[PDB]
């Protein structure tokens, strides 16, 4: 049940709540109060979802979907059959994600590391909450949230998108994308570099972080370095998600027309607005 | 408060690092360029040297040749007026030849020829850049991972512009050179193909792209969390595991019940990313060639 | 048809890739063990990969993983329960004993070397033409612990030559001897360096280095471990 170097770290302490009560593992998993919290919220989330399936008629996870309350409900509560379960499951979901994060913080404390991980996760949780809590509330109804089902959530995406034309024109959505693509470029390169040094040509000796800078400088004129690249991946990722949140929190709220049209501010600026020729003259 | 190691507090500079020399022809490295205090808060402050060479000179010349072919066409679309040029910069587009010209080069400079010229240039630019990715590694005696992984990105690019238009018997299936036009091409491609959300490869691509963000968020954060035990120093933690590698492995196994090595996290990393464009280019290449409607295909899968 | 053959091929490919990735990530820490160091019964469904061997640069030998796992060091902890899965209480001072968040590993007692086989890390005085280029130069600043008491004075920055980077602050104590403190665990301020992990009285306890112009990987581990463990193990002394 333990990695060969593990026991020296399995010492008491680091917990935020209930002191020694839940300070222990089950197999490889640390528990803690937040272990108990996430399990409770998770189980109740899944039982509500399982019960929701029965009301729908399927047990096929490719067909099961839980829809928010219809928009007439506004921000009120709904009947379980028609948005209630979702409303409760969302509370169990948020419960389980946030308990998972504070559990990670407890893991951090015991291990004496920085809290960067739970911090990072908090951004994912914030993107989730934007879609199901902040935007729906600013919009006056839970109906605007996405439904919990494998394909039906993709529907909500396509539908939500094409409410505003080609969503490509949302400018925050362009920033987010660029960060997602850039992150993935950076992930490929970073993996491949370290691997290319740890796994040199047959018979040769492992290279060195000097080789890693040398290679990249040779190649593009700059090397960010090994602290840098991990600051970078973290930043690209969190930015990608920061801007995903941003590009939906404004959609439906401050902007609700066709996004292509937002770009008219630019084309119509009075110093070139009426000049003939080009695509807009 | 407690320092997080997202920015450096103190910067330190020595003599310019001109770098290692293994089989590298030094006659072709530039000199070091300026140092940047700004960059030094985050990564390295040194710029250069770059290794120009024949493939460097080759790629860069074509790169620019491609970029000016499009920009000349834009300037022309602006009727030579720089007001209009700034103004409509994303509405301009260098569009491939019409369907009627198939895979020929029969068509005027305007109306397709300029697109082809610019594409040819892009082709030599990228492939030569690719070879430079391999050769630079070999010179230092390092692995060809960067080249194998860059190839996966090349795949998707090749598929969109070259393999798929060839397999559909026409260049007009290829992507135009414009900021807004190429987004329109994207949206139109999905509409004309039954909605790509129904392409299983397209969804796989998304899981890897979302997963790339998840993973690099995870990894970077983890390495910053264990930077107080020398974590960034990953190649020495491979050669000689330290408590940084152990604390990291155990954060994750106590969190989700399994973990990685300081070497193997980078195999997860390179693969997660590389499978974005891999699966992605399959999905595109199959579209209009084998499957005309992803919805339809989904219904039976035949 | 071709497309549905392609998707079926892929899920098979991906199962093999996950298999490969998980065995690759089993070249450290396996086999799994019980709390008394013996081989555990269930090891999971993945086997151990065939060994691979890194050739280390500077005559510094080879690493074959997997291989004989062994802490090569005493571990001062006792069980607190009659069954698995519970915490193991330090038997002495966990800071001194090097357990818990004060843990260190028995790395090679030699300094990490650079690409030319020169010591990668040096005090700035031995580091040819290296100077602070931006930020507050900490050299000369008094060091405060979390008990808001001064533990010493900064006397130098220990730098990474290849990566041009401050790695440690070397610190002179009331008795003239010095210690390294990791840069990552200090706050450089206009008029002071502040260290929350540790209280003034715990600075003497920081593990020393055998030689004044190099640090070994074993010593780095002992130092970083120690000062990190103070976040848990000084706590009653910390105050604000
Ligand atoms: C994948 C399916 C579509 C597609 C869908 C989308 C969508 C959707 C979006 C983009 C976006 C971008 N796309 Mg596109 N994109 C495709 C293929 C390409 C190719 C190519 C040669 O195959 C290129 C060069 C680009 C280029 C770009 C950039 C303009 C922009 C940010 C990319 C990025 O982060 O790069 C990674 C980071 C790097 C540092 C690499 C270099 C980045 C620069 C900017 C490259 C392009 C600059 C170009 C040569 C010159 C621009 C003109 C001047 C500004 C005047 N795309 C295919 C055809 N692309 C985003 C955008 O903001 O559009 C307006 C966006 O929202
Ligand atoms: C027709 C559709 C429209 C469109 C409409 C929309 C809409 C609508 C949305 C996006 C959003 C996004 N789009 Mg757009 N988009 C289009 C075309 C594109 C293209 C493209 C190539 O053309 C790209 C690259 C993108 C890119 C993106 C991303 C920037 C962003 C999604 C990531 C995200 O939010 O993560 C954030 C991550 C999360 C929310 C994950 C949360 C994870 C939680 C915290 C943990 C879960 C635990 C869970 C229970 C699992 C348990 C595991 C157990 C072990 C089992 N779009 C087209 C034109 N797009 C979305 C966005 O920005 O949302 C904020 C959004 O809402
Ligand atoms: C981000 C913007 C949109 C959105 C747009 C899209 C688009 C577009 C696509 C997906 C796709 C997926 N999305 Mg989605 N998706 C959104 C929000 C979510 C949330 C959430 C709680 O916020 C979850 C859990 C998911 C989950 C999923 C997966 C079922 C599938 C592959 C994703 C993946 O690997 O991601 C990255 C994460 C990992 C690699 C780690 C593991 C994640 C696992 C697989 C999550 C499984 C969840 C499970 C099936 C359902 C809950 C289980 C409970 C215990 C009951 N999405 C928001 C609303 N999503 C793709 C698909 O291919 O088919 C539907 C796809 O094309
Ligand atoms: C309305 C639009 C359609 C749609 C249409 C398409 C189409 C069409 C395509 C994608 C593709 C992708 N889409 Mg989709 N997509 C939609 C909805 C989504 C949503 C969402 C939230 O709804 C998401 C998250 C995505 C996500 C994705 C990605 C997983 C995938 C692109 C991977 C990548 O990195 O490409 C970017 C990477 C590259 C383009 C490779 C570039 C490498 C080259 C060699 C480098 C060029 C350098 C050049 C010389 C310039 C030099 C610059 C200077 C040096 C700086 N789509 C909707 C349903 N999508 C692509 C794919 O693979 O689909 C299966 C694709 O073709
Ligand atoms: C901020 C940048 C990126 C990021 C970071 C990130 N994610 C993280 C972390 C971090 C740093 C963790 O530490 C944590 C982890 O353990 O990772 C392995 C996590 C995590 N990210 C996860 C998934 C995930 N992350 C995503 C995204 C991202 N995560 C970003 C791209 C996505 C996307 C893109 O869609 C997904 C699907 C999990 C693997 C893990 C968190 C596990 C967790 O929260 O467990 C507690 C809850 C349960 C075990 C299940 C209970 C669920 C509910 C009660 C019921 C189900 C409701 C749900 C809404 C239904 C979903 C239906 C869908 C089909 C729509
Ligand atoms: C696995 C998929 C991911 C991936 C991986 C990947 N990409 C890679 C690699 C890898 C492993 C490389 O090794 C290679 C590289 O060099 O990285 C640094 C590369 C690369 N990925 C690149 C871009 C790129 N990657 C993308 C995507 C992705 N790459 C995926 C997410 C995208 C997207 C999303 O569109 C882009 C745009 C390039 C930076 C680089 C390959 C460079 C190349 O082939 O260049 C040809 C050279 C030229 C064209 C010369 C420059 C031309 C410029 C247009 C001129 C400069 C413009 C300037 C604004 C004007 C100057 C005026 C003058 C008068 C001075
Ligand atoms: C051992 O490890 C490692 C090292 O150490 C030795 C290393 O050195 C390195 C080396 C690393 C490098 C050399 C650097 C890598 C850098 C990148 C991959 C990219 C960095 C990019 C940024 C920091 C900025 C990104 C900017 C983005 C994403 C903005 C998007 C751009 C656009 C043009 C937007 C599109 C257009 C418009 C008009 C936007 C819409 C307008 C409005 C919203 C207004 C690696 C990889 C490594 O692994
Ligand atoms: C160098 O450093 C590093 C490491 O190590 C040296 C690492 O390992 C990692 C970790 C990364 C990997 C191992 C790579 C593989 C990971 C991914 C591709 C990310 C996605 C992960 C998953 C999809 C699996 C997620 C599974 C989860 C979240 C839950 C597991 C299953 C359960 C049933 C949960 C059980 C726990 C509960 C209920 C809480 C309390 C327990 C009770 C019993 C009650 C990173 C990032 C790193 O940088
Ligand atoms: C002159 O003006 C100044 C100085 C101001 C410069 C300004 C220039 C400007 C404004 C440049 C603008 C450039 C833009 C907007 C570029 C954007 C391009 C985009 C978004 C491209 C996106 C995707 C391209 C793809 C997918 C192309 C793939 C191409 C191939 C795989 C190559 C295909 C090759 C072919 C068809 C040729 C084969 C023929 C032979 C004979 C081998
Ligand atoms: C609300 C979404 C429902 C969650 C269902 C969880 C079970 C996941 C099984 C996915 C496998 C699909 N299938 C049936 C083809 O094997
Ligand atoms: C190397 C990383 C492995 C992670 C793979 C994640 C699997 C996600 C499944 C996506 C579902 C695809 N789809 C739409 C065809 O069903
Ligand atoms: C990629 C889709 C799969 C979703 C992840 C669900 C299971 C992963 C967790 C396995 C950990 C179990 N254990 C005992 C090995 O720790
Ligand atoms: C694609 C997400 C990752 C899922 C694949 C990993 C499965 C769990 C690994 C089990 C090995 C852990 N253990 C405890 C047996 O050593
Ligand atoms: Fe790394």
Brief rundown of the structure:
Chain B: A ubiquinone binds at residue 252. The complex is a heterotrimer of chains A (281), B (302) and C (240). With 281 residues, chain A is mostly helical.
Structure characterization notes:
- The complex is a heterotrimer of chains A (281), B (302) and C (240).
- Chain A has 281 residues and is an all-alpha fold.
- Helices cover 57% and strands 1% of the residues of chain A.
- Chain A has a two-stranded antiparallel sheet with strand order 1-2.
- Chain B has 302 residues and is mostly helical.
- Chain B has two domains: 143 residues, Photosynthetic Reaction Center, subunit M, domain 1; 159 residues, Photosynthetic Reaction Center, subunit M, domain 1 (Up-down Bundle), CATH 1.20.85.10.
- Chain B is globular.
- Chain C contains three helices and twelve strands, in the order αββββαββββββββα.
- In chain C, strands 5, 7, 8, 9, 10, 11 and 12 form a seven-stranded mixed sheet that branches. A two-stranded antiparallel ribbon of chain C has the order 1-2. A two-stranded antiparallel ribbon of chain C has the order 3-4.
- The chains are: A mainly alpha (281), B mainly alpha (302), C alpha+beta (240).
- At the A-B interface, strand 2, helix 2, helix 3, helix 4 and helix 5 of A face helix 3, helix 4, helix 5, helix 6 and helix 7 of B.
- Strand 1 of chain B pairs antiparallel with strand 6 of chain C, so a sheet runs across the interface.
- One bacteriochlorophyll A sits at the interface of chains B and A.
- One bacteriochlorophyll A (BCL) sits at the interface of chains B and A.
């Amino acid at each position: 049940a333990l990695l060969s170097f593990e026991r020296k770290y399995r010492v008491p302490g680091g917990t935020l709540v209930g002191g020694n009560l839940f300070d222990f593992w089950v197999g490889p998993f640390y528990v803690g109060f937040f272990g108990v919290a996430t399990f409770f919220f998770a189980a109740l989330g899944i039982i509500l979802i399982a019960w929701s399936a029965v009301l729908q008629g399927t047990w096929n996870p490719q067909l099961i979907s839980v829809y928010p309350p219809a928009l007439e409900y506004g921000l009120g509560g709904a009947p379980l059959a028609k948005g209630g379960l979702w409303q409760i499951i969302t509370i169990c979901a948020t419960g389980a994600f946030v308990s998972w994060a504070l559990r990670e913080v407890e893991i951090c404390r015991k291990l004496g590391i920085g809290y960067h991980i739970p911090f990072a996760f908090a951004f994912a949780i914030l993107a989730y909450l934007t879609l199901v809590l902040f935007r729906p509330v600013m919009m006056g109804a839970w109906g605007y949230a996405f439904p919990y089902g494998i394909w039906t959530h993709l529907d909500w995406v396509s539908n939500t998108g094409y409410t505003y034309g080609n969503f490509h024109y949302n400018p925050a959505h362009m920033i987010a994308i660029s960060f997602f693509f850039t992150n993935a470029l950076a992930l490929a390169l970073h993996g491949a570099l370290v691997l290319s040094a740890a796994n040199p040509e047959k018979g040769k000796e492992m290279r060195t972080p000097d080789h890693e800078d040398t290679f990249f400088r040779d190649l593009v004129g700059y090397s960010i370095g090994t602290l840098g690249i991990h600051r970078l991946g973290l930043l690209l990722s969190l930015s990608a998600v920061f801007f995903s949140a941003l590009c939906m929190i404004i959609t439906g709220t401050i902007w609700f027309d066709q996004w292509v049209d937002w770009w008219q501010w630019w084309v119509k600026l009075p110093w070139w607005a009426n000049i003939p020729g080009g695509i807009n003259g | 408060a407690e320092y997080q190691n997202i920015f450096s507090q103190v910067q330190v500079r020595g003599p310019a690092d001109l770098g290692m020399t293994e089989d590298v022809n030094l006659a072709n490295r530039s000199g070091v360029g300026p140092f940047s205090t700004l960059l030094g808060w985050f990564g390295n402050a040194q710029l250069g040297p770059i290794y120009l060479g024949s493939l460097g000179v080759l790629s860069l010349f074509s790169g620019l040749m491609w970029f000016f072919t499009i920009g000349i066409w834009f300037w022309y679309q602006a009727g030579w007026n720089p007001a209009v040029f700034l103004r409509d910069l994303f509405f301009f587009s260098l569009e491939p030849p019409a369907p009627e010209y198939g895979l020929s080069f029969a068509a005027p400079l305007k109306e397709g020829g300029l697109w082809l010229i610019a594409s040819f240039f892009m082709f030599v630019a990228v492939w030569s850049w690719w070879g430079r990715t391999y050769l630079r590694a070999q010179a230092l005696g390092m692995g060809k991972h960067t080249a194998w992984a860059f190839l996966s990105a090349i795949w998707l690019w090749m598929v969109l512009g070259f393999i798929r238009p060839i397999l559909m018997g026409s260049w007009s299936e290829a992507v135009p050179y414009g900021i807004f036009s190429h987004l329109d091409w994207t949206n139109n491609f999905s509409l004309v193909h039954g909605n790509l959300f129904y392409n299983p490869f397209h969804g796989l691509s998304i899981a890897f792209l979302y997963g790339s963000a998840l993973l690099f968020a995870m990894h970077g954060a983890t390495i910053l969390a264990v930077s107080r035990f020398g974590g960034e120093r990953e190649l020495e933690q491979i050669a000689d595991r330290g408590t940084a590698a152990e604390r990291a492995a155990l954060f994750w196994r106590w969190t989700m019940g399994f973990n990685a090595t300081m070497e193997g996290i980078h195999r997860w990393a390179i693969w997660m990313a590389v499978l974005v464009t891999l699966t992605g280019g399959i999905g595109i290449l199959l579209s209009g060639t084998v499957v005309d409607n992803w919805y339809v295909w989904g219904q039976n899968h035949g | 048809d071709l497309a549905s053959l392609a998707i079926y091929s892929f899920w098979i490919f991906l199962a093999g890739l996950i298999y490969y990735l998980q065995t690759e990530n089993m070249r450290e820490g396996y086999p799994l063990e019980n709390e008394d160091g013996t081989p555990a019964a269930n090891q999971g469904p993945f086997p151990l990969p065939k060994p691979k061997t890194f050739i280390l640069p500077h005559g510094r030998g080879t690493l074959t993983v997997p291989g004989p796992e062994s802490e090569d060091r005493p571990i001062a902890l006792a069980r607190t329960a009659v069954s698995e899965g519970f915490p193991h209480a330090p038997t002495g001072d966990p800071m001194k004993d090097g357990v818990g968040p004060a843990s260190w590993v028995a790395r090679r007692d030699l300094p990490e070397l650079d690409g030319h086989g020169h010591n990668k890390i040096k005090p700035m005085k031995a580091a040819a033409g290296f100077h602070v280029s931006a930020g507050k130069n900490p050299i000369g600043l008094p060091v405060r612990g979390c008990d808001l008491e001064i533990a010493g004075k900064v006397v130098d920055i220990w730098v990474d030559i290849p990566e041009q980077m401050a790695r440690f602050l070397e610190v002179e104590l009331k008795d003239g001897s010095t210690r390294l403190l990791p840069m990552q665990m200090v706050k450089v301020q206009s008029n002071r360096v502040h260290v929350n992990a540790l209280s003034s009285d715990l600075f003497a306890g920081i593990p020393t280095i055998k030689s004044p112009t190099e640090v070994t990987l074993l010593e780095e581990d002992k130092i970083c471990g120690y000062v990190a463990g103070g976040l848990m193990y000084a706590a009653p002394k910390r105050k604000s």
